[PDB]
Amino acid sequence: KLQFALPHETLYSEVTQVNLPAKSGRIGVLANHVPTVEQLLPGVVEVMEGSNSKKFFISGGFATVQPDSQLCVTAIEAPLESFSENIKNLLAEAKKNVSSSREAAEAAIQVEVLENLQSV
Amino acid sequence: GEWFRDNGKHALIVYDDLSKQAVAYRQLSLLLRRPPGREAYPGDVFYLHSRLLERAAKLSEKEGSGSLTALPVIETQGGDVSAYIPTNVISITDGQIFLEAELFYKGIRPAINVGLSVSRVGSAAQVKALKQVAGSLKLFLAQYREVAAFAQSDLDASTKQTLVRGER
Amino acid sequence: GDRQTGKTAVALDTILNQKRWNNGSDESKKLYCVYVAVGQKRSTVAQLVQTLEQHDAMKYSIIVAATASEAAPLQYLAPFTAASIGEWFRDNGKHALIVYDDLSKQAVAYRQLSLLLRRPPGREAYPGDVFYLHSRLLERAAKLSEKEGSGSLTALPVIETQGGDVSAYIPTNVISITDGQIFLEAELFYKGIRPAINVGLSVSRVGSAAQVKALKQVAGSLKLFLAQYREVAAFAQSDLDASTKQTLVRGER
Amino acid sequence: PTNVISITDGQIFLEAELFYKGIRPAINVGLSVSRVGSAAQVKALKQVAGSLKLFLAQYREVAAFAQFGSDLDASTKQTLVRGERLTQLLKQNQYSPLATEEQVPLIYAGVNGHLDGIELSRIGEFESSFLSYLKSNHNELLTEIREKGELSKELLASLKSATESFVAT
Amino acid sequence: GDRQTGKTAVALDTILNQKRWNNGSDESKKLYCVYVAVGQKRSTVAQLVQTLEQHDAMKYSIIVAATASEAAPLQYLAPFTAASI
Amino acid sequence: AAVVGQEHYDVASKVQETLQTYKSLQDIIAILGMDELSEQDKLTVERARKIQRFLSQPFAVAEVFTGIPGKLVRLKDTVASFKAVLEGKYDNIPEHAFYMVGGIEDVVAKAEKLAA
Amino acid sequence: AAVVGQEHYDVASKVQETLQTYKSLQDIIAILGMDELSEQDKLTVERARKIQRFLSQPFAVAEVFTGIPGKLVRLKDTVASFKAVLEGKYDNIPEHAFYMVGGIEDVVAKAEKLAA
Amino acid sequence: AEYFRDEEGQDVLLFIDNIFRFTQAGSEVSALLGRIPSAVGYQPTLATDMGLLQERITTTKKGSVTSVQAVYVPADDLTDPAPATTFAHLDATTVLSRGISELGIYPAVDPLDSKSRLLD
Amino acid sequence: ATLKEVEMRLKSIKNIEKITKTMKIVASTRLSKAEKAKISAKKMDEAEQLFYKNAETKNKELIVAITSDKGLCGSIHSQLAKAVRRHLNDQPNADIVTIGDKIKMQLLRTHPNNIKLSINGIGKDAPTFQESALIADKLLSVMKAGTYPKISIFYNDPVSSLSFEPSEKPIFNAKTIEQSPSFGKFEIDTDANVPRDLFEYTLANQMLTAMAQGYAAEISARRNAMDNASKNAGDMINRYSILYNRTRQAVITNELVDIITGASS
Amino acid sequence: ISYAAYLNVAAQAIRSTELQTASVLNRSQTDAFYTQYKNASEPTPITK
DSSP states (O other): OEEEEOSSOBSOOOOOEEEEEETTEEEEEESSOOOBEEEEOSEEEEEEETTEEEEEEEOOEEEEEOTTSOEEEEESOOOHHHHOOHHHHHHHHHHHHHTTOOHHHHHHHHHHHHHHHHHO | OHHHHHTTOOOEEOOBOHHHHHHHHHHHHHHTTOOOOGGGSOTTHHHHHHHHHTSOOOOOGGGTOOOOEEOOBOOOGGGOSSSHHHHHHHHHSSOEEEEOHHHHHTTOSSOEEEEEEEOSSGGGGSOHHHHHTTHHHHHHHHHHHHGGGOOOOOOOHHHHHHHHHHHO | OOTTSSHHHHHHHHHHHTTSSSSSSOTTTOOOEEEEEESOOHHHHHHHHHHHHHTTOGGGEEEEEEOSSSOHHHHHSHHHHHHHHHHHHHTTTOOOEEEEETHHHHHHHHHHHHHHTTOOOOGGGSOTTHHHHHHHHHTTOOBOOGGGTOOBOEEEEEOOOGGGOOSSHHHHHHHHHSSOEEOOOHHHHHTTOSSOOOTTTEEOSSSTTTSOTHHHHTTTTHHHHHHHHHHHHHHHOOOSSHHHHHHHHHHHO | OHHHHHHOSEEOOOOHHHHHTTOSSOOOTTSOEESSOSSSSOHHHHHHTTTHHHHHHHHHHHHHHHTTTOOOOHHHHHHHHHHHHHHHHHOOOTTOOOOGGGTHHHHHHHHTTHHHHSOGGGHHHHHHHHHHHHHHTTHHHHHHHHHHOSOOHHHHHHHHHHHHHTOOO | OOTTSSHHHHHHHHHHHTHHHHHSSOGGGOOOOEEEEEEEOHHHHHHHHHHHHHTTOTTTOEEEEEESSSOHHHHHHHHHHHHHO | OTTTTHHHHHHHHHHHHHHHHHHHHHHHHHHTOSTTSOHHHHHHHHHHHHHHTTSOOOOGGGSSSSOOOOOOOOHHHHHHHHHHHHHTTTTTSOGGGSTTOOSHHHHHHHHHHHHO | OOSSOHHHHHHHHHHHHHHHHHHHTHHHHHHSOSTTSOHHHHHHHHHHHHHHHHTOOOOSSSHHHHOSOOOOOOHHHHHHHHHHHHTTSSOSSOHHHHTTOOSHHHHHHHHHHHHO | OHHHHHHSOOBOOEEEEESHHHHHHHHHHHHHHTOOOOSTTOOTTHHHHHHHHTTSSSBOSSOBOOEEEEOOOSTTOSSSHHHHHHHHHOSEEOOBOHHHHTTTOSSOBOTTTOEESSOO | OHHHHHHHHHHHHHHHHHHHHHHHHHHHHHHHHHHHHHHHHHHHHHHHHHHHHHTTOOOOBEEEEEOOSOOOSOSHHHHHHHHHHHTTSSOTTOEEEEESHHHHHHHHHHOSTTEEEEEESOSSOOOOHHHHHHHHHHHHHHHOGGGSSBOOEEEEEEEETTEEEEEEEOOOOHHHHHHOSOOSSSBOOTTOOHHHHHHHHHHHHHHHHHHHHHHHHHHHHHHHHHHHHHHHHHHHHHHHHHHHHHHHHHHHHHHHHHHHHHHHO | OOHHHHHHHHHHHHTOOOOOOHHHHHHTOOOOEEEEOOOOOOOOOEEO
């Protein structure tokens, strides 16, 4: 089915449709989708197991449909709601940080996260 | 004291300290060449103390309830209670109060360690009001003694609650 | 060994076993065994007497008694008198045995006497001549030479160690006199080993060539082996090595 | 023993366990005292051994902590490293006395941590050799220490230099 | 410290470094050493005097002795008469 | 707290409790270590070690014992200086900068001495 | 170190010191273990355990009592035997190999017996 | 008790309080008599006096006294001679515990601690 | 005195028994969180392994080992030290990155040369993704991990909740990932940098898992040790208690003899 | 920058409205050092 797993938690260890943002744009996986390995970009993820749909904000990871149709999703952390106003404030400060500064790359990643936040 | 007791009255006699009474009897006995005994105290030091400690009394109500509360004081030389004069006296008296040095140092004055204090008559002469609202107190403190054996970290909530209640 | 672990019973079993030796025809085989009951409740001894007469062993055995009620001078002279009887058998050349339960109470008795004679208390408050008493008593028991009729009077004196204190003056004094000791482990006794024997705090060195040769051949190195069991269980809290494990398994069985 | 202890102005404890431990002469320095202290000894030797007592006392405390299997910080191991060498320095053969002129250098060296650097194993080698080096070169210094029984600023510096010169070996 | 576990040797060490002053001049620094031996065997003493003679220290040592055999009064008396010397 | 006044008493009470804690924790520190005791405990231990050598004061008659000039401190000054230490205003002062000091000035001075 | 020779004394010195250390840590070893004490000490201890066992030597008059044939080891042999063990030359074989036997040659042989 | 046993045939049961205070009383009587206190102060005749007492407590043909005695251990030291001498007479030991009573179990009796030789 | 020196030492042992008891309880508390995390962590790892297995990916040399800075957790440190040492006989020239002061010390003895990178500040800490990630980032840069086509990781697999067996696993570099036979069933572009990325991602994920397995084993071992400590201390308490009781009596008797001697005069 | 470092930074940023539990915060906030060694010589414990 689907393994959706975090180090200290598991979100959804027969899932029908999953919509994922990956290094391949956005990919949707529906029942049998031929087996892939794609690194998951930091993401806003929707998982539908049956018609029921769960909305996640996910810190990226790696995605792998297995040949046995075990959709191994591994990601570091997440719900959408948990990520969600103060975060918007903090990111403005972080945006300021990009002006100065690995720390340079880090602040750039923070801007990428700001884009990811903007998606919400 | 007997005059007061006999008059039916009550009174409190504090013998302080029977340890020095003991030494005096020792001095007396040894100088009279009267036989020495355990811890070089005469053997009838027990007899002396017991005679004294049984004169304290709460008379029959036909004898007018003549009380004569007593509170003898024994000085523990190096905290010794196994010592012949302490062991005897502890047995003779009903109740003991044993204060601890650490508690004194920890600014707990009274430095009474109520782990080593007991009263047998106890709640018979405890105010009823005070009995009600301190049955709980006994149990809380009892737990606090057990929960003194956590004093480091990762501990049960119950233990943490106990520590707060007990310490306060 | 320790108090009322059926301390007496261990000796009683020996007396009983000798019934195919004490009803054994050969007079060399015949022991005439003396049970000295010192400081023991007269009732308990009466139960012992009944046990002995139940095992019909009474007829080859003597009971000498100096009970707890019986006075200290009687107790003091109690082993000495008994040993005279033992010597009568010995001096018939005939083989005998005397089991003295408890010489520890004889020590307490001599202590009582000494104090009441105002004689100064020796070490552990037991008179300084306590050694002399035990040594004069103990060295009577003997295997005499064929010239003297090959007398025997075996001695099994029963010492009741309080708290298993074997450094104690009376025990050490006895140990030095005696050849072999049979210390009994209380912990094991309680923990279901009856009889419970200390496999090295019981020693002997005079019985080993006096024991049956069959039981010398078969018993060869078993003392060592169970002092390898002793080692194995020493370091178990030895190896998971099959040899050590095998020793533990053998030891347990 | 109690009676004598009161009477005496010092106690010079020697401990058997420390003998077996291999401190020969075996001195229980914790209980060895002279209540009045130093002025009944040579001034030079007083100057050099000023912090020797402190070092040893610190070593004792540090050494105790280590045996409880609690991890040691570097500060304790500076003490430990210094202390160990000092203990080996103390050890001396029975029936071997040492002239004060040749006890002043060794203690100066130790207190000035030259031997705290030098490895524990070869401390015994160093002591003998150090004396030999001073006998060759700074034997004038040894004579001065004997003759004047004090260490001047110049003499202390000279002595420091001598030890330094023999820091090779 | 525990009996004669070089306890005796400690005293001999003092004598030996004092060999330097004794042999040396300075009369007021010449510690003519007085060794008092109480309760000790003749053999022990005999070894000591040989060691001391080897070390040429019985050129300034005085040995006051009360051997193990030599009486209890003499043993009591030995320190006080050593003191007088 | 009235015989020698409340301040004197309170300051000394803090010392007694602190030391009693230090001693009790000394056993824990022995095997487990000081680091396995709380931040509050570590600060208490640190204060106690500082206080421990703050007690150390040389004497005029130990210019022949230790050979170190004595130190005399006014009664008011001692009370004040212990209060300060406890407040931890002088917990920026090394432990050995309390060793064989006198007044507060000396505690500071020995910090400077160590600094140089 | 000259009465019985320097080599003898050195060999003996190391035995005494080593064994005294092992005895010294007996309290700590028992409350804890050797896997909670220093590695350096653990080597010393393992060596010492072998040495302790090495000290065994059934007597020829005890040969009856022990039940093990007597062992008489020459002084010249003895110094050699301990020297090797102290340098751990033959330390690498069972502690029981050293147990109830005399000389170094015998220990080696009893290791061979154990090995079978 | 003996009038009951011997002369009324009755089996009776005689309680004694502290046998520590029996011993203690005897110890004093030796000292009062001037007789040299036997080890740990106790009378030299401690054993014999107890012996008479506890062999007049037994089963005669007529009847039997039985005695339950109260032993107040002397400073919880059972290595002491007075407990040992008492234990010689004892056929059972009943070991009441207040811990057990605190487990609400009245019988106060601590079962594992209590041991008898009459159990066989 | 015998009596006082016994008594104080016995009091010390008593306090020690109590502390080792206290620790055993605290250890159990600490252990529960460690294990809980480890389940989730291990589950996450298995999903990655699902790829590696199905891919049949497989495998100088790197050695990484994990143990705490702190000691007294039993023989976790030294069973691990021995099993590292066993595999350090297998290749002496391999570069050891030691995560933990205790494993560092033991290994430092066998080879000090091989100690190349080490981590101080991990010891008390429970597994955290951030640490693993940062160590991984430094591991890639400093040790050039991919250059060593063999990687080996050591940890303590917590075999039973009373046991720990040190265990090891490899971390698959991009070269391995590339040449795995099934890798076409898994679909990704030939122009993807996904092998070298998946290597990096699983560098941290495997390392974190290795830490989780180890940490749980470590805290569990510490509990076991501290329980046994209480027992060992107890045995000595009893032995010295008998000595104490005897000594108490001995003082009384020796004093009594003096009293008698005095009385006689 | 390394892929898992990239994701790490993202995860840390992602634990920001804040609502988060301590354990989340701990997986995203830990203090430590890395003491590099040499073939011997140790580049000093620099905060990781």
